[PDB]
Amino acid sequence: MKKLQIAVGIIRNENNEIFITRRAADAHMANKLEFPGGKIEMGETPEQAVVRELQEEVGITPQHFSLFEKLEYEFPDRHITLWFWLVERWEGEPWGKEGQPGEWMSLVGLNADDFPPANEPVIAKLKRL
């Protein structure tokens, strides 16, 4: 079974809103809401991966960020380790840089059912802030 390390960024603005994108219909976890992110490549660190992934996916450079949560999840056909970084400072303005839907969502209104099930404890913990 495939094993992956994934780095994602929880992009939070001053109004307690999070920048959320929607996954493609033909991707793993198709049509789900997501924190922007992707696979940590060989020769790069988890911190370097979340910077690169957010630059690629939404056109911002995160800075002075923190590890909010790290967890493992076994999907039906793959095992992933997710690194959730809390990003509250960045250069740039996030947008759908890869043509994907993106928008700001109030933290209090997030529905964990809209996200991959691996995100359940993270969305709960975010609402605890």
Ligand X SMILES: OC[C@H]1O[C@@](CO)(O[C@H]2O[C@H](CO)[C@@H](O)[C@H](O)[C@H]2O)[C@@H](O)[C@@H]1O
Ligand Y SMILES: Nc1nc2c([nH]c(=O)n2[C@H]2C[C@H](O)[C@@H](COP(=O)(O)O)O2)c(=O)[nH]1
Main-chain phi, psi angles of 15, to 5 degrees: -100, 25
Nearest to 53 by CA among 124, 112, 4, 121: 4
CB of 38 to Na ion, least distance (A): 3
Can you tell me the distance from the alpha carbon of 90 to that of 23, in angstroms, rounded to the nearest whole number? Answer: 23
Interface mask toward ligand X for 51-90; x: CB under 6 A: ------------xxxxx-----------------------
**Shortest Å, Cβ 73 to ligand Y:** 6
35 binds ligand Y (CB under 6 A): yes
- Min. distance of Cβ 117 from ligand Y in angstroms? 7
What Cα–Cα distance (Å) separates residue 57 from each residue in 2, 7, 94, 97, 98?
23, 12, 9, 6, 6
By CB under 6 A, residue 124 contacts ligand Y: no
- Residue at 17: amino acid letter: E
Binding site for ligand Y (CB under 6 A): 6, 8, 27-29, 34-35, 37-39, 80, 82, 116, 118-119
